[PDB]
Symmetry: D2
Subunit: 454 residues, 4 copies
């Protein structure tokens, strides 16, 4: 079932039009997995909604405006995602997605007003849906709205859950004393609470970093039009559209103070990617630490008992693996690659317009989503159920050579050397040698007194 638009066949069941069909014919790169990410499309919904309402100030008939507003909300609410077939690998201004949005909002609005789909009557994609706007200033506007929403709704709440779970564990483990490891080698004592407090600070700081990388994300290009001058838009449009987006989202969007910078570069997305990159480094460390600390159960480090969620092996009967650590550390690796892709696009602006926009936002949204979702999965399915193997930890304290120093201000090396050579404990050796009693060793050597400055 098709309709003719114009000279192109458009499926009768689709709201897009000829310019979207036109764009599908020539950009068949990577197929449907490569379709423009949903948050971009939704963000466009919010944009076209904002612009339509504001445009009533500049001669937009309220009947048309209201229908566009309603159609856009449907877009923004993810109700019309099947009407967006274009890939990331399209024109690098993202204009083809802008046209897609205009066409879909036009035809849904037209339907709503009882017109014929494809007619451009009474809602015209360019004259009404794109009123006061351009390709060059719309896609970057959507990018930033989409990035900020993803950070506030997915990324930061994920991190917060992780931070809170780690902090709870740190408190739970505050009196559990284990052997430090530096260079992977046995080192002086600290609590599991202390070590976990390190992970907490890193996630606290990851969140601080991401927040720090947001102010320029809230700057919107809308109003720059073709080259940043604002040619062919109305005075005040730029500001009023930013403000409507802010009020619709509850986020502090403002018009970009320099539209040339806003269109010719996407340095804010590179900045935000940079924050996610630091965050990936932090999470790699935390998840890899917990992976190793949970290793065994018998012939690894064995300090942590990680929740068992599924079987690990068809051959090795009863094996269970730290599979949440793995998804998280894989996501961390992906984010680091995503960042280089964003950097290469960001660096490759030409004169008035950076035309790597779709790829940059694809990578930013992918990193943000992966990090947010992994942080929740890792929290709910690993961190919250972590228990300490205190038997193992306690045995490893009593079997370590790192406590020998406690005896220095009592008896004055040979214990440690002999214990090391004989394979025995510090206590066993001290007694075998006859330098102290079993009661004495217990008096002198108190690991709870080895956990701070004196």
């Amino acid at each position: 079932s098709f309709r003719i638009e114009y000279e192109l066949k458009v499926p009768n069941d689709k709201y897009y039009g000829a310019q979207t069909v036109r764009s599908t014919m020539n950009f068949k790169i990577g197929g449907v997995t490569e379709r423009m990410p949903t948050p971009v499309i939704k963000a466009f919904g919010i944009l076209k909604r904002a612009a339509a309402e504001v445009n009533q100030d500049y001669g937009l008939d309220p009947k048309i405006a209201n229908a566009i507003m309603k159609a856009a909300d449907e877009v923004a609410e993810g109700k019309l995602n099947d009407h967006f077939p274009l890939v990331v690998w399209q024109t690098g201004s993202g204009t083809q997605t802008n046209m897609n949005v205009n066409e879909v909002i036009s035809n849904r609005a037209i339907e709503m007003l009882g017109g014929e789909l494809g007619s451009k009557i009474p809602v015209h994609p360019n004259d009404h849906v794109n009123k006061s706007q351009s390709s060059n200033d719309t896609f970057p506007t959507a990018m930033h709205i989409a990035a900020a929403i993803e950070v506030h709704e997915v990324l930061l709440p994920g991190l917060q859950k992780l931070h809170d779970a780690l902090d709870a564990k740190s408190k739970e483990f505050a009196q559990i004393i284990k052997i430090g490891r530096t260079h992977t080698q046995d080192a002086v004592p600290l609590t599991l609470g202390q070590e976990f407090s390190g992970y907490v600070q890193q996630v606290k700081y990851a969140m601080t970093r991401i927040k720090a990388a947001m102010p320029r994300i809230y700057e919107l290009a809308a109003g720059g039009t073709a080259v940043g001058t604002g040619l062919n838009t109305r005075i005040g449009f730029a500001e009023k559209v930013a403000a409507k987006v802010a009020a619709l989202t509850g986020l502090p969007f403002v018009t970009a103070p320099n539209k040339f910078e806003a269109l010719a570069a996407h340095d804010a997305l590179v900045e935000l990617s940079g924050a996610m990159n630091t965050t990936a480094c932090s999470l790699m460390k935390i998840a890899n630490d917990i992976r190793f600390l949970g290793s065994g159960p018998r012939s690894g480090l064995g300090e942590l008992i990680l929740p068992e969620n599924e079987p690990g092996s068809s051959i090795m009967p009863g094996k269970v693996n730290p599979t949440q650590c793995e998804a998280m550390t894989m996501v961390a690796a992906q984010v680091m690659g995503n960042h280089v892709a964003v950097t290469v696009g960001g660096s490759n602006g030409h004169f008035e317009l950076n035309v790597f926009k779709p790829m940059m936002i694809k990578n930013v949204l992918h990193s943000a989503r992966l990090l947010g979702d992994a942080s929740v999965s890792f929290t709910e399915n690993c961190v919250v159920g972590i228990q300490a193997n205190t038997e193992r930890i306690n045995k490893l304290m009593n079997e370590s050579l790192m406590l020998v120093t406690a005896l220095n201000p009592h008896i004055g090396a040979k214990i440690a050397k002999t214990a090391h050579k004989n394979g025995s404990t510090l206590k066993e050796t001290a007694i075998e040698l006859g330098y102290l009693t079993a009661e004495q060793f217990d008096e002198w050597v108190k690991p709870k007194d080895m956990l701070g400055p004196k």
Copy 2:
């Protein structure tokens, strides 16, 4: 609308219209990372259907009942053929060995094979997901096997044929523009002449060499881990199984799959994937250059360079080099993907690298993007490019680079005087030569011949 199934952790509801089982349901519950766009790539799923098909045939030499084997071979074929893709809901961001996808595959094939035999789905009867579908295998050696199969098919069916179109199209264009002389540019400044054909021949060479680089990075992709089992020893597999399955995979694909000579290296690392991603990274550099040049050479129509007229396939009356944009975006993405692969590859622990899903996702992503982009750039840009000869001819006549042609005919000092004079006055060399009185228009035309400025 659900049936009840079981694994060793216990009982789970599975939707009646799905061939997967309890461990797949379990994975969906525990790995909610990224959503549907993050599903295990289809090439890995199809590759698994190839492998399981191969395993099931060979396993008849090791006891597997023919009735069971046949059914398994037919199910696995439907997986390989892309008939069962909706029965694979699991994401890339799962266990780092890809075990959960292995189990997805075992379950989907087990159930389709049971249905073909009129058994009850989810019963493990008569085709058990582990004891039959996964006979003589481990997640540890099967997921690497599927990766390399997937990788090789994508290179052979998508990447290389894409690059071949592009090579051939650039080379035809090189030939077509062999007689068109333009001003070379070095540091972006006017240099000395070369033909448009010569310039395009550099691109042809770059693409030829990209293909050679990809092919050079393939030998260790053909090495399959299958047979290493849990840690690379082959524990619980019969001798000969490694080699028989690798050969069956070769015969099923027409590609030179062989058994990895060191199964520890094959499980503990995915250096071959890093190598291949490396070749694609070079290819992305070559393509960035070609497509950026073509973009700039087509710039204008009036205040750019304006040497090439690129096909107008859509509206910008404005129209933009939109295929060059797609392609240079793809190229940038490949470079990022390459770092993701390298970080994953760098991070093996002891007997198993557990970054496998992420590594093959990026390699496959890069291969499909480069291949598809190459076809699109060829068909929708390269083949239609025309030279704006009226513009190129006008720029030749207005360049100051040709004045050295006058040296032997009038001396260096008069030749230098002309360039300096035309430079200050904004005039042609010829105008200034004639105005200064050093020569006639007829002498200037006989003396300054850019076609004699094209070789040693």
Copy 3:
């Protein structure tokens, strides 16, 4: 002429004209990786001078004899002031805690302080490298402290002043060019008008935003690990040492250093360096764009765009009349590509901490300092040898207006 010192593996000749000792010599043998270009960065050595100077003055509170502390303070100052650079032969590619450089520092300062007090070089008397120079310290908390001191100082003295000069020169040119109307380019295609001042204002905003980004990426660089000792607990150090040492370093430098609130996080990761590198990475993206634009806009003399006349910085060629190569554009864009690579190196090291200690420390600071210095110096060089000398070809800019297919004075803002 040499002296003989010993370490746990043997006697060693130490040249009598050097203030380092046995441990340094042994490190030169055991880490023969890369050569003289790979030497630990001078800013790290200098930052060690400041740190050991602070620790020595502070350690008087915790029993360090004043005559020993004063010699150590003096000798440390000479290290900090760059008077002893030749006594640090060690490469970046050493232990990942940078222990050997801490030992280098301790040895050098010991032997210079010994000499000031009139003792025998190589003797550990009366100034002992571990017991006095390293007093209250660990290699694990000293190298991170020196890294952050080095990075902040390089950010303040080199990177930010470099970018400031560039911002100011671009802005000057934006103003100078504010009334020159040119053709905009989008997708490289001819577009609607903008001024050259307008286009240049984009570049000015980018550099302003770069400095903003870099300053935003500093707060956690000011946190110092000193006091965390071996694993973060501060075991075997004295209560109040962490704070006193950070406060002394803050007074010594005039930068706002503080003790890291969480020492485990301070030792186990260098996420602040990754953050700072990320800001330089964005800056590199900005500069790549500015420098490449200026490159293309200056193209010609007749087959390019020809909007800008760039100052000549090379001899002319007779074979190519009028060719003027954008030399600083090339210097800057190479530097930009370099910072992007360096950032990946920092990221990989950052990601690879183990338990109580990240042992990728030397390479992470080397990359950070490399990027900072290249960006600062390239920003000053690009300013003084390109930007300030830029002229517009108003004849050609304009002629390509009455030639464009796109009153232009009435097309530069909204209606």
Copy 4:
């Protein structure tokens, strides 16, 4: 000081230096990054080789043999590292490296003039451009020097370092061939493999690194010389390109050839990206090897403790830091960032000339030399002295609950899993549990559960 001149004013040139006015102006105009950023000596030496080859060939094209002879001698001195102090320029110069080409022409001119008994700074009788640069461009000489430098560094530094490490790892693999250890997958206790088998994996990775690097070398052997300004070879003599490549081939003993397409050779440095690609793979391999050895040597008592690594530091008693593992893993991380640098430069060619050349070759050489030296140092100071803790290895392996895998073909997966879970709940042996469970006799367990039988297929 002597006085010399360029188009921008008078320049003092130190009497004790062989460089000239263009070099001096370059030190003034490219003050980026300081001394560590000086152009790599391998590049300088490689230019020595090229200018030696060019001088000898140019005797076919009008070069006075007296002059040529003196240029050859001076060029040999550069190539032998006798004149390193006369190259003050940084990597961060023009993107074609023209200032280094100028530096080399000035130095060779002046040292040649001094050999002929003329005046330093005079361009008489050896002109830096008319003689030392005869038949050459700035645009084809720097790429030629890049590839000569890269090829030499691969053959003299990188491949021999890797070879040594390969041989040391293979020796250790043989030494450990009968030590049965526990495999770890996902870091979890697994089934046995020998320590020799685990080390055989490292051995294969280094073998393959060397194969990868050699596979990435063919297009590095391609030389741009003769391409001149844009690839066309305008203003050079026919046969110069072929003759200089052959002379470079002959001087070095490496299979250098002329680039079959000079446009590709000048407009891109894809071969450097390719070579860097091979080093990046190599870095992943070394990261894994060095990280494993690090972790395997962890202890003395709260780590894995399977390996005893050599002491490289003063003595926390018993603590032996894996210092070489640390140097090697830092180096591996650096090669990965360097690869990005090379990639960004290589991606950014314009029209007839890629102007990222100095940066690209600096990163390639930096990666080759760090990998080569680190591999030697890792071999000599770690790998050759590695010992096994056989007592600890044995106990760690015997304790693995996943030895129960042995019982699969005898009693089935489900009953092996119950043995394992209940051994893990109770803290019992596998044997104590299976006897108590009624699943096997003590004797059937001993005959079914034998680690020395789990090392290969049935």
